[PDB]
Amino acid sequence: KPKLLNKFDKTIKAELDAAEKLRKRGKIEEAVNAFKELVRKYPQSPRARYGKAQCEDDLAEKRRSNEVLRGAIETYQEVASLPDVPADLLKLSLKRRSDRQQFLGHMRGSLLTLQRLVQLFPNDTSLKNDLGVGYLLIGDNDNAKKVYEEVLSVTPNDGFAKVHYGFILKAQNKIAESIPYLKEGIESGDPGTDDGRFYFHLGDAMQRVGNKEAYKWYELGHKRGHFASVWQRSLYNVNGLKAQPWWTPKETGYTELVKSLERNWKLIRDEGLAVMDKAKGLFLPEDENLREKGDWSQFTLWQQGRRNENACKGAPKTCTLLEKFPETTGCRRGQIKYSIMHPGTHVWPHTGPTNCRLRMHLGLVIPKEGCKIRCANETKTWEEGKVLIFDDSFEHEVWQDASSFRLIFIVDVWHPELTPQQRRSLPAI
């Protein structure tokens, strides 16, 4: 269906097809030398150059080599420098470049490729949509929002643009504005709209505005396979792990860790209070838009299984104690952090990103009334020197209506059923 042969390439079509047939059969090494001779004998053939780049792509896949793939990326670009390149071939080659550049983590490089595509094909709406994705991946929501606005100005009912526009609005706390975009986008059925991210935030946005129909979108996200359950809505999951809102120390197996926290809880408290009094700046405000109201800060010692050395200078005894427990210092999908919360604070119902961690809370300073945490349909209270354990991949919520501050210690551990091989291989979150 795609036209990939310019006038000259049609005159060597049998040579080109013979080389491609070698590649489709999996004879990658013979297809590499086939297209190499084609590139040597016809250095201006776009189809021969695309064949070279495609063989390198399969060779990188076969060898799991980033460097080989990097050679493919450059060759994909060489196709676009050749003269008399068909438009279909020009798009395929450069789109695959951005795709492989993202797979390697070269977000700034994919960005340039995507910009060249929009310039070379200013009437392709999908290429503008892909440019917005490149921005969303690098962290540039401002340029991502302008892109989808330009898309919506021309094609206002493009569903892909609507869900991404809605996602950007929600992330910017424009809750009410984002609902009609996330809803119309998902309902459009356009390619790219059936994504758990859009179901997740559409139901959360509706929850924040008191829209009772929020769970209808959680239910449909479960039916479409994006959520393990209507309650447990994490999106970076290992399937099969025991789903349970609340956990007991013995259920987790980390009883040695729980005893150490509950035996030495006062030293952990004291170092926290000491930071509160003489190093307030180490406590950083929560910055994921999880608060309806109030004040909430976190002092993080371990993140992504990495220890912050300067943070541990503020709690050296606590960091010394925790280093004996790799099930938490090595949880690259969790943290170790003090969490302080003051009266007048309500944390929105939310869920964490992954089901691969369990979350421990050690009570350090707990006022006698006004503090409580709900996970799923069960609500509990903290206690000074005791450890609660819950799966934050379930929906959870917190209120702080005391008359003084409430300080706890948050300790994430790998899900107990995760094998050591999985704990080493899972990408960090």
Binding site: A60, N66, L137, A171, L290, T351, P427
Partner: peptide, 19 residues
């Protein structure tokens, strides 16, 4: 940005190529 407590980012992992 990183997804520490929620799912607010478009992507929560960092791409590092092949494994």
């Amino acid at each position: 940005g990183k997804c520490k407590d929620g799912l607010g980012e478009y992507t929560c992992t960092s791409l590092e190529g092949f494994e």
